[PDB]
Amino acid sequence: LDVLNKKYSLLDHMQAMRRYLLLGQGDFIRHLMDLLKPELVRPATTLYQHNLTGILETAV
Amino acid sequence: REIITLQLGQCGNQIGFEFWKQLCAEHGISPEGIVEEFATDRKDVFFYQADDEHYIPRAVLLDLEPRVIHSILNSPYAKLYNPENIYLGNNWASGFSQGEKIHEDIFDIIDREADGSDSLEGFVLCHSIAGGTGSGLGSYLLERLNDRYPKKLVQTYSVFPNQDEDVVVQPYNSLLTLKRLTQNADCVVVLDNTALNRIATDRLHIQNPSFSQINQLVSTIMSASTTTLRYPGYMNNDLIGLIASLIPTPRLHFLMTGYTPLTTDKTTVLDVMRRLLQPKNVMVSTNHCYIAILNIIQGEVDPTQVHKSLQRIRERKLANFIPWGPASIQVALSRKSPYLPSAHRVSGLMMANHTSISSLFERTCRQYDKLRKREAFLEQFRKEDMFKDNFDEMDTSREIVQQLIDEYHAATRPDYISWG
Amino acid sequence: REIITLQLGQCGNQIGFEFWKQLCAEHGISPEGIVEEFATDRKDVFFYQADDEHYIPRAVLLDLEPRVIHSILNSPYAKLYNPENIYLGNNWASGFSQGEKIHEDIFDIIDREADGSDSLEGFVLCHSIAGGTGSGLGSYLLERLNDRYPKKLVQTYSVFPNQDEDVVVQPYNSLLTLKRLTQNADCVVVLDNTALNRIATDRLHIQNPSFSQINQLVSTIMSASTTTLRYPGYMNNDLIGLIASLIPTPRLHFLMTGYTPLTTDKTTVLDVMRRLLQPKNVMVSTNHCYIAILNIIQGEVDPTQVHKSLQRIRERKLANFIPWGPASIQVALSRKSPYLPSAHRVSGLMMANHTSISSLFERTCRQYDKLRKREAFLEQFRKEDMFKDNFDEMDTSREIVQQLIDEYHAATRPDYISWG
Amino acid sequence: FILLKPVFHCLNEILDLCHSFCSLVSQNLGPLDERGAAQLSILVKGFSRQSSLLFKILS
């Protein structure tokens, strides 16, 4: 347990799977969705991951 | 996003400086502006953030005939702030024309700071209602900023004058400022002088440094009301999402405040809420009923007990309104502030839309009408003549607040589908 | 390969001498010319290299009516340079005819130094636009060297006169020199007098030794702009590969400069780039938009952070041009100079093609047209009569800059497939 | 991408196309047709064709 919670940050993962996946962070994700509006409202066949990975870097 | 603070009037610049010192002490900075190495905190909403370890507070220093502002200017905190917006009677029309002549250059200063800013949510005004030199001018600049930015929100923190009347021109000044406050402003935080006066005379037996303690009390309120915005929030950490529920219609947009520690010169959320519904916790003094109620709690808390709490308030029926529609008492939570010791670790605030303030309006509606029948209280000078030769703006103001009283009374009734 | 430096005009010979002393201090030499034993350095591009430990700087000392040049001549550095090219009004036509009569012997001196040289890439002119004695003469010799070597590039470092107008003949002189600058010259580095003046009055409160500090600032710029050429570079270490991207069409070939330390009387590449896009870092003061942008960074740097940096500039959208075509902001890197201590170890420069300079051109287009309507400002002497009896070169100049303004405006539009 | 990939062949093809393009523009000097239009048309079509190939993996 000790080497796992320090060497691979087992606890920080638990902190971040509710914060990030589940919007437990709140701010960062709303700011993400706020940047993500004009892209996502377009029909998604004309969108690709290279713009999303570009705007993700970017808030974060 | 970010919100720009504007301060005007003598009392307004006083409480603005008090609020800025409150947040310098609250956050990890020194009074030089130099960021402290001693630190849930964000300083990016109200302070212009550089790398440069001098986070210049976003406050526009505008005033008419400055006298307290000089004493504010020479201070051991005046190295932390210098945004270069400093500029140099007690009637509404005089201050109105005086703001009218210089509005373009001070609006150029506003445009400068708006250009430097990237995002904007609102303009929050430090203001005093019928404050004399501040009023008139403040309403005109309010009209200018409301005209010039239609995509933005406007909030005011302003105290309503209540000395239980003697100023002979105060109903005129407060009345005209109120007309601009309804039709050129959309978020009004209302506070009374006399309720804070009675709370101060409850805790102490002072009458002379009253403005100091009132500054402290209202400063606590403006920090608490903005804490969920400044400290990282996820439920109405925007102003618009906050006052969305309390504004059912864009004529009725008025808020009174509550606060649980009042006179100190279980702690459960059940108890602080049952406290906060009492009218002695309200800072504004035929039944008049609420339209919609919002509250925030800051502390170290559970969530099953708030379920029992708001269930208890429900079965208590100690908040008996009947407007027309299926609203709620709205429980929300914010972070309790670290980095400074504070008493009452569990502390609550409420903002609601209440029709009781119509009675206060009717006081002025009585008073001004009496003075309008006498006509010795308009003071009738050249500023008043050049502002309006017929004083028909007084009649337009009167019919506007008259429609507002009608809107209050229709909103209290179960029929507000019935228009006039 | 190697580039021959040519210097002319009073301000041009001043900044040339300043640049040569800057590189003598920058490289391992003493002011005798004697190579120093105290040392990424190459001295073979601008200094004639022998074994002989006196590396004679490749600068042609040509001037009209010399007065500052004598003070340059007697110096404690004048043992380092002696290439024997020294030769002995303020109107364009007067200086033009004066250069016209002596062009063959000074071109024989040019031919001598070109014969001594093995390789050649460009001729870089120290020049002042509408400098009086330098102008006219400088444009004529520019026409001669542009005619005589068609396989070679021509660059100028010249300051545009901007004193916010009083010289009554400056629009004529600068206008005629500009016509030769577009059609007989292909690489123009544009700088303004007033922006450097405002930066100098920002850092200090001086007005009298202004030319000294301006010399220092521009000298830093010409060293930085040539550093990737002089210090061993592999990406556009040629002039042509540098200004290939910034010249989309051979009429539009104009560059303004940027530089991050401006007024000093994280450091990451994200931050210096976000600095450099601000117009206060630009030395030249209806939206006008860029056509193509290039930048160089000199420092001790990473490459994942420049990826995040130019990604940040991308998502910032703080460079909002829309010319017609798929160009980029072009990030390039050069060696930070050893052998001398320099502040701001991370230092950036930008050269771009911007249409804002059209507005500056239109200023002269206004001014000269007004003076052409008045006709008291051509001064109308025998040099002006013998240069052009009808002054139809003024009309040819005017229609050329007129076509240039049209090319600017078509280049800003998404249609530049549409010719006039 | 010097490792053996389809992208590696694609870049080789890019290079050969560019090299023939340099070879064409060398003798043309200034724009006036020397019957260069046919090969030029093939090259400008080839650039569009290969530009489509970078759109194969756009994720």
Curated annotation (Swiss-Prot), chain A:
The source organism is Homo sapiens
Q: What does this protein do?
A: Component of the gamma-tubulin ring complex (gTuRC) which mediates microtubule nucleation. The gTuRC regulates the minus-end nucleation of alpha-beta tubulin heterodimers that grow into microtubule protafilaments, a critical step in centrosome duplication and spindle formation.
What is the protein name stated in its UniProt record?
Gamma-tubulin complex component 3
- Source taxon at top rank: Eukaryota
Instruction: List localization entries.
Output: Cytoplasm, Cytoskeleton, Microtubule organizing center, Centrosome
Tissue note: Ubiquitously expressed.
Q: How does it assemble?
A: Component of the gamma-tubulin ring complex (gTuRC) consisting of TUBGCP2, TUBGCP3, TUBGCP4, TUBGCP5 and TUBGCP6 and gamma-tubulin TUBG1 or TUBG2. TUBGCP2, TUBGCP3, TUBGCP4, TUBGCP5 and TUBGCP6 assemble in a 5:5:2:1:1 stoichiometry; each is associated with a gamma-tubulin, thereby arranging 14 gamma-tubulins in a helical manner. Gamma-tubulin at the first position is blocked by TUBGCP3 at the last position, allowing 13 protafilaments to grow into a microtubule.
Q: Which residues of the full protein are shown?
A: 546 to 605 of 907
Q: Which family does it belong to?
A: Belongs to the TUBGCP family.
Residues in the signal sequence: none
Q: Which residues form a coiled coil?
A: none
UniProtKB/Swiss-Prot annotation, chains B, C:
Keyword check for Nucleotide-binding: yes
Cite the post-translational modification comment: Phosphorylation at Ser-119 by BRSK1 regulates centrosome duplication, possibly by mediating relocation of gamma-tubulin and its associated proteins from the cytoplasm to the centrosome.
Q: Which GO terms describe its biological process?
A: cytoplasmic microtubule organization; meiotic spindle organization; microtubule cytoskeleton organization; microtubule nucleation; mitotic cell cycle; mitotic sister chromatid segregation; mitotic spindle organization
Any idea where this protein resides? Cytoplasm, Cytoskeleton, Microtubule organizing center, Centrosome; Cytoplasm, Cytoskeleton, Spindle
Organism's domain of life?
Eukaryota
* Disease linked to the protein: Cortical dysplasia, complex, with other brain malformations 4: A disorder of aberrant neuronal migration and disturbed axonal guidance. Clinical features include early-onset seizures, microcephaly, spastic tetraplegia, and various malformations of cortical development, such as agyria, posterior or frontal pachygyria, thick cortex, and subcortical band heterotopia and thin corpus callosum in some patients.
Q: What is this protein called?
A: Tubulin gamma-1 chain
Q: Which organism is it from?
A: Homo sapiens (Human)
- Name of the gene: TUBG1
UniProtKB/Swiss-Prot annotation, chain D:
The cysteines joined by S-S bonds are none
Location within or outside the cell: Cytoplasm, Cytoskeleton, Microtubule organizing center, Centrosome
Distribution of this protein across tissues and organs = Ubiquitously expressed.
Q: Which disease is it linked to?
A: Microcephaly and chorioretinopathy, autosomal recessive, 3: A disorder characterized by congenital microcephaly and chorioretinal dysplasia associated with poor vision and nystagmus. Variable ocular anomalies include microphthalmia, retinal folding, retinal detachment, optic nerve hypoplasia, absence of retinal vessels, round areas of chorioretinal atrophy, and attenuated electroretinogram. Most patients have mild developmental delay and mild learning difficulties.
Q: Of which family is this protein a member?
A: Belongs to the TUBGCP family.
Please describe the quaternary structure of this protein: Component of the gamma-tubulin ring complex (gTuRC) consisting of TUBGCP2, TUBGCP3, TUBGCP4, TUBGCP5 and TUBGCP6 and gamma-tubulin TUBG1 or TUBG2. TUBGCP2, TUBGCP3, TUBGCP4, TUBGCP5 and TUBGCP6 assemble in a 5:5:2:1:1 stoichiometry; each is associated with a gamma-tubulin, thereby arranging 14 gamma-tubulins in a helical manner. Gamma-tubulin at the first position is blocked by TUBGCP3 at the last position, allowing 13 protafilaments to grow into a microtubule.
Q: What does this protein do?
A: Component of the gamma-tubulin ring complex (gTuRC) which mediates microtubule nucleation. The gTuRC regulates the minus-end nucleation of alpha-beta tubulin heterodimers that grow into microtubule protafilaments, a critical step in centrosome duplication and spindle formation.
Q: What is this protein called?
A: Gamma-tubulin complex component 4
Species for this entry:
Homo sapiens (Human)
Q: Which gene encodes it?
A: TUBGCP4
